Amino acid sequence: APDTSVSNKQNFSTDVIYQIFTDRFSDGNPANNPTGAAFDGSCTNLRLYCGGDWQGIINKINDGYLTGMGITAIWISQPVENIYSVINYSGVNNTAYHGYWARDFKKTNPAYGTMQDFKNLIDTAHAHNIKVIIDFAPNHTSPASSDDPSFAENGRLYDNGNLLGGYTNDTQNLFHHYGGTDLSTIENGIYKNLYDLADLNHNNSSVDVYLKDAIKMWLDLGVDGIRVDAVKHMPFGWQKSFMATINNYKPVFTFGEWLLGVNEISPEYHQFANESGMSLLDFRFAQKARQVFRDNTDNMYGLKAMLEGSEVDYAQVNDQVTFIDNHDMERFHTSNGDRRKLEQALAFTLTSRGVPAIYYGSEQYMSGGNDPDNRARLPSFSTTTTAYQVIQKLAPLRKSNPAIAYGSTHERWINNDVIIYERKFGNNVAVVAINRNMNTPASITGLVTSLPRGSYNDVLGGILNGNTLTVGAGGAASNFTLAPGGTAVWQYTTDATTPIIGNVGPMMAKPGVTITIDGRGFGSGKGTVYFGTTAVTGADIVAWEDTQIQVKIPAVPGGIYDIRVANAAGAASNIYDNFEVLTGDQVTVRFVINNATTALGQNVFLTGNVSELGNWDPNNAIGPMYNQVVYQYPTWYYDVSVPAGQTIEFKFLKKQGSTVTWEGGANRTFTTPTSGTATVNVNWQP
Ligand SMILES: C[C@H]1O[C@H](O[C@H]2[C@H](O)[C@@H](O)[C@H](O)O[C@@H]2CO)[C@H](O)[C@@H](O)[C@@H]1N[C@H]1C=C(CO)[C@@H](O[C@H]2O[C@H](CO)[C@@H](O)[C@H](O)[C@H]2O)[C@H](O)[C@H]1O
Numbered sequence: 001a002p003d004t005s006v007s008n009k010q011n012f013s014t015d016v017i018y019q020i021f022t023d024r025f026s027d028g029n030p031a032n033n034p035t036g037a038a039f040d041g042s043c044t045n046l047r048l049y050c051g052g053d054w055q056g057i058i059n060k061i062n063d064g065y066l067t068g069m070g071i072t073a074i075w076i077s078q079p080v081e082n083i084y085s086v087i088n089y090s091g092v093n094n095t096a097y098h099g100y101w102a103r104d105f106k107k108t109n110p111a112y113g114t115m116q117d118f119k120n121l122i123d124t125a126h127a128h129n130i131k132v133i134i135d136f137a138p139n140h141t142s143p144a145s146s147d148d149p150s151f152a153e154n155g156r157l158y159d160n161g162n163l164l165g166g167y168t169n170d171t172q173n174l175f176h177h178y179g180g181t182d183l184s185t186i187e188n189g190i191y192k193n194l195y196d197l198a199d200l201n202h203n204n205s206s207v208d209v210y211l212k213d214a215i216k217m218w219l220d221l222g223v224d225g226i227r228v229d230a231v232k233h234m235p236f237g238w239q240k241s242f243m244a245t246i247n248n249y250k251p252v253f254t255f256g257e258w259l260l261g262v263n264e265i266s267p268e269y270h271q272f273a274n275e276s277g278m279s280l281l282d283f284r285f286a287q288k289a290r291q292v293f294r295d296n297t298d299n300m301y302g303l304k305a306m307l308e309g310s311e312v313d314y315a316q317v318n319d320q321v322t323f324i325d326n327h328d329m330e331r332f333h334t335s336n337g338d339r340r341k342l343e344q345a346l347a348f349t350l351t352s353r354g355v356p357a358i359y360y361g362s363e364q365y366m367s368g369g370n371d372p373d374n375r376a377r378l379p380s381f382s383t384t385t386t387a388y389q390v391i392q393k394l395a396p397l398r399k400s401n402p403a404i405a406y407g408s409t410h411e412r413w414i415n416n417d418v419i420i421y422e423r424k425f426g427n428n429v430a431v432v433a434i435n436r437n438m439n440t441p442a443s444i445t446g447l448v449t450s451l452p453r454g455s456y457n458d459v460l461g462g463i464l465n466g467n468t469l470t471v472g473a474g475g476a477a478s479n480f481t482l483a484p485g486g487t488a489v490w491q492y493t494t495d496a497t498t499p500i501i502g503n504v505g506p507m508m509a510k511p512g513v514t515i516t517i518d519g520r521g522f523g524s525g526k527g528t529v530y531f532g533t534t535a536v537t538g539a540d541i542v543a544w545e546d547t548q549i550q551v552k553i554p555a556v557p558g559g560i561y562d563i564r565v566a567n568a569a570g571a572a573s574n575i576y577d578n579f580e581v582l583t584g585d586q587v588t589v590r591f592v593i594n595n596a597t598t599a600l601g602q603n604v605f606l607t608g609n610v611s612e613l614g615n616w617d618p619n620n621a622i623g624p625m626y627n628q629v630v631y632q633y634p635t636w637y638y639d640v641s642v643p644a645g646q647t648i649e650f651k652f653l654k655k656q657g658s659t660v661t662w663e664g665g666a667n668r669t670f671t672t673p674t675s676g677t678a679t680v681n682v683n684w685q686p
């Protein structure tokens with residue numbers, strides 16, 4: 001089907017996501033509203049339920065509020081049943097309005113709707129070519145005190161009505177009981193509890209299998225994407241086996257939230273987007289966009305350096321979800337902030353690389369500080385605000401112009417307050433000019449673009465004071481003055497004669513899974529897909545058309561491969577690298593090694609004979625292992641995704657800089673479980 005189709009669950013670069021807090025959008029069914037102390041119909045106590053639901057979203061899709069804006073994907077609050085308690089935290093009452101305090105991952109939150117209401121939402125969104133992304137928060141259940149079992153619902157987890165267990169007297173060890181995190185280390189943030197939430201123990205086989213069973217249930221209901229909460233607070237090896245469960249079953253676009261502060265660049269963050277099998281909410285983008293367009297704490301050279309730096313640091317930058325604010329930030333618009341600042345920041349996000357997300361109420365200029373004040377009920381459904389019109393004119397270009405959905409980003413003109421960049425994909429191009437200075441016009445001289453000659457009209461129709469661009473020979477533009485606050489977008493689309501790959505989804509799966517390769521210029525007739533030098537042709541190519549190919553992963557050994565497409569005429573595409581072929585289905589095994597004493601700067605790692613363990617390469621070994629919370633030094637431990645049902649060979653090693661010290665003796669062997677969990681507990685062999 002085409003790359004822009006609503007049925008494309010794997011890749012979202014052609015979409016614009018509207019992020020809805022279900023409770024704060026529209027109460028379409030008053031009969032499902034919480035009663036008593038859990039409800040506030042005026043929505044002035046922002047920690048109570050206001051009444052918004054799935055019928056309210058169905059209504060705003062039907063009457064054209066969302067589709068008039070050009071939205072093609074909706075991201076809603078976690079749909080699962082939550083605790084019913086009103087918890088009083090030092091005077092103020094709190095409810096699960098936000099969907100994050102789960103008690104049954106197999107049932108719906110009835111304040112939002114019934115399972116029939118969820119089905120009706122999937123089907124009415126799809127009939128209007130809107131994809132549906134759900135939050136999924138598998139790190140915890142709800143507020144709990146094992147010392148006081150009467151507090152809230154004591155973190156109890158149910159499985160479709162059946163109690164699996166609570167936090168007090170957890171003889172099954174369904175939960176973690178190591179105390180609360182001080183966030184000092186990533187290790188500390190993973191196994192210790194955050195706030196008062198009952199942390200799930202993913203090394204318990206029942207919890208592992210249950211969470212994997214529950215995500216497949218929501219995939220069977222037709223969801224198109226998953227946003228997973230608190231990814232830096234769950235074992236990276238368990239999350240990799242969780243992604244393999246999704247990708248080897250029904251692959252959908254998945255991304256997580258790993259929060260970064262202003263001008264924080266974390267290698268672990270980039271490593272997670274590049275290796276987990278999921279992408280990330282692009283905080284690096286969001287924070288620099290706020291410094292330049294909102295806070296004025298950096299200028300356009302900072303913006304340029306972030307766009308240029310992130311194109312390299314993210315192995316698949318077209319999968320990162322961008323935004324200028326969301327549920328974990330103060331709203332972009334401030335009380336004394338010029339609305340043009342919000343309007344330019346939205347135009348910047350909508351024409352940039354990645355998958356744009358707009359937080360509900362941006363188009364109505366909502367302001368508010370941090371939680372809960374950034375989650376007020378949206379005040380109006382006015383269809384005529386400038387911000388609504390800016391999204392309406394620009395959001396369609398992600399479907400119609402492949403330079404915007406997939407293209408590279410090239411700075412063509414810049415100074416402290418102005419940037420003009422070009423997006424380019426084959427011969428499709430979009431050029432965007434932004435002057436953030438609200439009182440000084442900018443004289444543009446010397447602009448050269450990849451546009452053919454013509455008089456290009458601003459796609460924004462001059463509403464943000466843009467102008468026509470006259471382009472002559474060699475892509476040279478005639479000089480112009482960019483108005484104060486001016487933003488203009490100019491574009492040209494045409495056919496690709498040669499194959500170009502813009503995006504691939506999923507990026508990690510076992511042999512036989514169908515992956516989706518999107519781009520332009522593939523042609524009508526089936527050609528060849530290369531995974532490395534292995535060619536797959538004929539019946540293994542499930543679908544071929546000019547913008548999308550669906551092909552089965554060949555039976556190649558586990559490892560990472562370059563993908564390349566050749567059309568029927570033998571013309572080959574660009575390489576899309578970093579694809580990981582798994583050895584098979586995954587299970588997460590806890591590896592524990594005792595008596596492994598180390599020097600300062602020396603850490604313990606694991607490697608072995610399958611690609612998941614780095615294929616005996618010390619530079620690709622698993623670790624550094626942990627050694628503080630679950631087990632303490634000199635015992636080291638780590639949760640590692642490993643192929644299910646087979647005998648692996650492995651050894652531990654110590655690494656300090658360039659020096660590797662391998663365990664002596666024979667190679668260790670272990671037969672892994674077919675999907676469930678397991679622990680290996682061994683002693684260092686000198
Ligand atoms: C649990 C929180 O998770 C998300 O934010 C994460 C992010 O995904 C991580 O990878 C990142 O690195 O750390 C962030 C912080 O954990 C999500 O976006 C947050 O909004 C989410 N917050 C929830 C959960 C709770 C905790 O029960 C609520 O806070 C309550 O807890 C405190 C202390 O007990 C009380 O004083 C408050 O009054 C409670 O509301 C939040 O309301 C809710 O937003």
Ligand SMILES: [Ca+2]
Pocket residue numbers: 027028029030031032033051052053111
């Ligand atoms: Ca309601």
Ligand SMILES: [Ca+2]
Pocket residue numbers: 139189190191192199200233234235
């Ligand atoms: Ca955790």
